[PDB]
RNA sequence: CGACUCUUAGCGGUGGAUCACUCGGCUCGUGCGUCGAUGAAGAACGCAGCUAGCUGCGAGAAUUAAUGUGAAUUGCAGGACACAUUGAUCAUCGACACUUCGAACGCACUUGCGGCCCCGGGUUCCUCCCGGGGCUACGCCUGUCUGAGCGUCGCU
RNA sequence: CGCCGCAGGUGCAGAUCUUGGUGGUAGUAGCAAAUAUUCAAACGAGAACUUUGAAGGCCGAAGUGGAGAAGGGUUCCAUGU
RNA sequence: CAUCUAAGGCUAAAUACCGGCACGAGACCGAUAGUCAACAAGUACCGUAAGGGAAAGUUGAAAAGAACUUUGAAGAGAGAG
RNA sequence: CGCGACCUCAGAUCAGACGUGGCGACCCGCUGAAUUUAAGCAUAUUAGUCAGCGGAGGAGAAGAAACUAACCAGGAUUCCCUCAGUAACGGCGAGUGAACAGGGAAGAGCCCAGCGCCGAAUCCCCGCCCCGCGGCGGGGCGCGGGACAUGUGGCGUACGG
């Protein structure tokens, strides 16, 4: 809601900076094996446990 | 009807996030962490769940004490002493 | 053969120790051999990879005499880039090909102040265990 | 006594666990009270304790305690055990006068149920498969 | 330019808070010009700035600690920071005094029937 | 892990296997049987001095 | 406008730009943003120039 | 069910024996730490006899073991004063004083 | 004759069995056998030039110092780095530092609300405002100070 | 891998078996609750569905309108694919 | 007749150890096996919660990871390397 | 109708300490089932076990006889082999079930209260100085405080003193 306490806005925070694809450089790195952000979350299919 | 209608009118929290142990179990009528039991000083932990007490048990998480307690032991716990400076 | 119960030789320890190893005992597992001149000169069979010492490739599809430099130590890839040992990829642009340390001798060191130090003190070894042997 | 403390007196199955009333708890009094002023006092080590005069429905018990942590006591000789750290709450494991009495320890024919040490190590150990290499 | 924490350590704590400001100033314009898009040369410094700033804030830190330690040198009581801390069980054990200490009935048998060395021949 | 890894064999079978192996060490045929090539060598019960 | 630590109220963010900037406020209105770091607005006083010390800063 | 003819069997096997199994695999790890414990205690006690002290002579209490003599725990304080050696000295000697034995022969 | 359907074969797809490999387990054994109010385990939130996760770390934040080592780190960039008017990296780690909850400690869980004592500014001492620092949990031991009692007494 | 011995978590068609994959059904059922769309143009490789304009309609103020509370958590706003 | 001397206290060694630190080994398993987890695994995800809980290893010696020409709006092709 | 002594209590953000919580494989103290077996089932069994609560240490507990024995006697505790699936318990059904002696691993013994004697000989705390630091002790100094005769310390403990 509008009506937030501070420390669920904070926690609301974390969660919508880490919602973010990995850096494109990350595939040069040697020895990657990885590919995509696979802990990605949409705020319609899958919901936070908060 | 007890189905799909009645899903509808749930939009009130039984539980929040808990201030110890962080897991969204603190009854807010009740004012206790149905996880680690938190109006109470002793965490809440029981034998017939092994795979609870294995989640939260010691080394789960940062260490960040014990981790360099467990490199002083193989000195001794030396302390007040340098590496004689060159 | 291993008679010492703290030293594994397990397979699997082995190669986990290896290609985790730390840099700076990645940098000896990088030694190479010294040539001819250079060991009789000195004490010393191997030496660990420097910056800026001149090198021969001695195997693979790089073999031959000249001499080249070594241009870059990658020890995160466990090779060395030597000037001349290059391949032309697709645009047209020259890249190094890297070759294990093993596979090349050194002609010539890059000698400074510890270089000096650790070839002294390999050479003063030797010669103990030359004379314990005698 | 000790009450089983179920609910409306309700034990359920096997008439023969279906005591309530007079059933008897395995410690003395006596071991309640140094339990319960140990208990309290957490920064003391409980000694002993004797009796002074009961009731019909209280007893009354002093119980002798000792800090620890005290240079009268840390600074002397046949006290400096009590300051060990295995000596802690001594209360609560049943190794004091009162508390080892409940424990059926002694030498002879009369105690042979902890002959281990304790009732649960003689359990153990009469109960436990010896499975040597060679069989 | 680089400075070094074995360089530091003759200056007084006048001038090492006044270099430790600069310092502070020089991060500030530089966490600037990172937002102002800047230059690559310039985000590089970031670090460097801020590993600098971490070496005079340690080497005062440390000045003070050794000073205060010096000063409650033979105190009977020292603040909770400057007594050892190995471990909490460690710290409430007896010390070697009131651990090797016997009563005068133990000594008295020790003094008059001693462990004596000896052999038995066949 | 209680699988009876181990066996024991009497003492007296267990010297009587080593005197059958002794025996058998001492004939050309089996240890040639046993493709150890000893052409060369003589007298098949093989025995140097201390020195060695 | 700056971001500043969440942990400083605008009594200690009008002090603090006040001193290091050598410039006087008039008042400070703060939010948090959705990222989780405050931003300050700081809106100078009528003799001095907004335009006049972003150049000084250098984030004209 | 019984199949023809054998032993009525009763095994012990009621009691779920499979948590409390000892097995033996540090039996020989057992002996050696046994054994050198053994040695760096002979050589501590470097004239001393490496075995404990002298035992006296015993006689087993038994009408089965009446007839075999063996070791006691230590000499009784009857034994100790007609060979005139005090008992507080007697265990630096080496010699096990055991106070609570009594000689009726 | 086509079409369709079936069988077999070649080739091509779908699928990921088989085989080979293994920085992972499982089992056994050995030596140690060490947490915490000097604030643990655990949680939260932050910290990278470009960084989401994992990892490491704590406002000195993918780390400071010190000591060994001795020219790298590396996906790109950057500037270093005389390697002696002292050194990249890595390792070790004994100095320093170590945010907020948490036994969690001023009260309460609303970054809600206090109290006392010092310091600096506004005061231009008088004490109102702002900032900084240190205290303010419960139980309990020894001692200290202050006390209560028509408790037992002594002197008037 | 053969041969002499040793030891097994040693042989599958079934268990409405476990896991994974694949068929016929089958280009099939279906994409039918709440009246309704049409004309021209623009962008565009591409228009029944986008946008603009014109028309015909519907919600008809107890709304298919304008705002909030719980709840969600960036879905808000621009630009680009 | 024998035997001990209760109602106070301490005491090492031989003994135990499926948690912890660091090791060594194996007639064990070999990616549906072996720990649930060989991999950003107690993770993603599910449940109000207690709690439940996966799937997922392999280019190549070296990226030398296909320049360049051409059709298509591109995916995608044909040559080339 | 005050001022003192003691006793019994109280307050303090008083000076200095201590406990709390975690892990819990092993260990100690409690509490404690039912499934299951008995071809049903209630005593019995499962089992003093799972679950539950408390307390520790590197081990823990035990431990130096109010013992075993009945012998020509042995001699703290703990562990191994054996005794022994035995004596015994048991709807004497299903089932349960030790100890002594013997051989080994290890081996170690002691301290109080009391009864007495010794001018409280005893102990803590705060200051002085110096010898020191390195987990903080020694020495002496105080017409310095307190504890303590409602009993501190030395001798001494069933083997006698
Ligand atoms: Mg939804
Ligand atoms: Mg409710
Ligand atoms: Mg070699
Ligand atoms: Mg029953
Ligand atoms: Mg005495
Ligand atoms: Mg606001
Ligand atoms: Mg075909
Ligand atoms: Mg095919
Ligand atoms: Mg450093
Ligand atoms: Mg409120
Ligand atoms: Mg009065
Ligand atoms: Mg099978
Ligand atoms: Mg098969
Ligand atoms: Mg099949
Ligand atoms: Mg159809
Ligand atoms: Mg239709
Ligand atoms: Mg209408
Ligand atoms: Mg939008
Ligand atoms: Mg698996
Ligand atoms: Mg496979
Ligand atoms: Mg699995
Ligand atoms: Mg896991
Ligand atoms: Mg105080
Ligand atoms: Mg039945
Ligand atoms: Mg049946
Ligand atoms: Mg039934
Ligand atoms: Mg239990
Ligand atoms: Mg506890
Ligand atoms: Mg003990
Ligand atoms: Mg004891
Ligand atoms: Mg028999
Ligand atoms: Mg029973
Ligand atoms: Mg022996
Ligand atoms: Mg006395
Ligand atoms: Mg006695
Ligand atoms: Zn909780």
Redesign the interface.
């Given at each position: 809601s509008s009506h937030k306490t501070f420390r669920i806005k904070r926690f609301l925070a974390k969660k919508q900076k880490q919602n973010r694809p990995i850096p494109q450089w990350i595939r040069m790195k040697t020895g990657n094996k990885i590919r995509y952000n696979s802990k990605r979350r949409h705020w319609r299919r899958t919901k936070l446990g908060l | 009807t007890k189905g799909t209608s009645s899903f509808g009118k749930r939009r009130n929290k039984t539980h929040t996030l808990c201030r110890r142990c962080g897991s969204k179990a603190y009854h807010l009528q009740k004012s206790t962490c149905g996880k680690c039991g938190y109006p109470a000083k002793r965490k809440r932990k029981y034998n017939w769940s092994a795979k609870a007490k294995r989640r939260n048990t010691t080394g789960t998480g940062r260490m960040r004490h014990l981790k360099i307690v467990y490199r002083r032991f193989r000195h001794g716990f030396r302390e007040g002493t340098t590496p004689k400076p060159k | 053969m291993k008679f010492n119960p703290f030293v594994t030789s397990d397979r699997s320890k082995n190669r986990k120790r290896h290609f985790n190893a730390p840099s700076h005992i990645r940098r000896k597992i990088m030694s190479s051999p010294l040539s001819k001149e250079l060991r009789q000169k000195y004490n010393v069979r191997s030496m660990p990879i420097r910056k800026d010492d001149e090198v021969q490739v001695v195997r693979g599809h790089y073999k031959g005499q000249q001499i080249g430099k070594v241009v870059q130590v990658y020890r995160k890839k466990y090779v060395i880039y030597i000037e001349r040992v290059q391949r032309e990829k697709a645009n047209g642009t020259t890249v190094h090909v890297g070759i294990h340390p093993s596979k090349v001798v050194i002609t010539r060191l890059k000698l400074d102040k510890d270089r000096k130090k650790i070839l002294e003190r390999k050479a003063k070894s030797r010669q103990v265990g030359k004379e314990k042997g005698k | 006594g000790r009450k089983r403390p179920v609910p409306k007196g309700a034990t359920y199955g096997k008439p023969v666990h279906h005591g309530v009333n007079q059933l008897k708890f395995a410690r003395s009094l006596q071991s309640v009270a140094e339990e319960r002023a140990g208990r309290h006092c957490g920064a003391l080590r409980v000694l002993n304790s004797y009796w002074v005069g009961e009731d019909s429905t209280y007893k009354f018990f002093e119980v002798i305690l000792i800090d620890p942590f005290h240079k009268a006591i840390r600074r002397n000789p046949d006290t400096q055990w009590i300051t060990k750290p295995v000596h802690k709450h001594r209360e609560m494991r049943g190794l004091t006068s009162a508390g080892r009495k409940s424990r059926g320890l002694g030498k002879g024919h009369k105690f042979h149920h902890t002959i281990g040490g304790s009732r649960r190590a003689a359990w153990r150990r009469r109960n436990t498969l010896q499975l040597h290499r060679y069989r | 330019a680089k400075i070094k924490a074995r360089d530091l350590r003759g200056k007084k704590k006048e001038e090492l808070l006044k270099q430790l400001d600069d310092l502070k100033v020089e991060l500030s314009q530089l966490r600037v010009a990172k937002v102002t898009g800047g230059a690559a040369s310039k985000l590089s410094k970031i670090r460097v700035v801020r590993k600098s700033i971490a070496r005079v804030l340690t080497v005062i830190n440390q000045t003070q600690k050794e000073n205060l330690r010096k000063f409650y040198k033979g105190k009977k009581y020292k603040p909770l920071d400057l007594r050892p801390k190995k471990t909490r069980a460690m710290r409430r054990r007896l010390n070697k005094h009131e651990e090797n200490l016997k009563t005068k009935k133990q000594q008295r048998k020790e003094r008059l029937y001693p462990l004596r060395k000896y052999a038995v021949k066949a | 892990?209680?699988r009876?890894?181990?066996?024991?064999v009497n003492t007296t079978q267990k010297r009587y296997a080593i005197c059958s192996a002794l025996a058998a060490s001492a004939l050309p045929a089996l240890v040639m049987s046993k493709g150890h090539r000893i052409e060369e060598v003589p007298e098949l019960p093989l025995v140097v001095e201390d020195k060695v | 406008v700056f971001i500043v630590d969440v942990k400083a109220n605008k009594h200690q963010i009008k002090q603090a730009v006040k001193k290091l900037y050598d410039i006087d406020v008039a008042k400070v209105n703060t939010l948090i943003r959705p990222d989780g770091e405050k931003k300050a607005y700081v809106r100078l006083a009528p003799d001095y120039d907004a335009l006049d010390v972003a150049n000084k800063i250098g984030i004209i | 069910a019984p199949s023809r003819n054998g032993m009525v069997l009763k095994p012990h096997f009621h009691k779920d024996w499979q948590r409390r199994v000892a097995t033996w695999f540090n039996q020989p790890a057992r002996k050696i730490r046994r054994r050198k414990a053994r040695q760096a205690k002979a050589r501590r006690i470097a004239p001393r006899p490496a075995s404990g002290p002298i035992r006296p002579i015993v006689r087993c209490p038994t009408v089965r073991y009446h007839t075999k003599v063996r070791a006691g725990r230590g000499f009784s304080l009857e034994e100790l004063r007609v060979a005139g050696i005090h008992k507080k000295v007697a265990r630096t000697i080496g010699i096990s004083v055991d106070p609570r034995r009594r000689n009726k022969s």
């Open positions: - | - | - | - | - | 892990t209680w009876r890894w181990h066996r024991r | - | -």
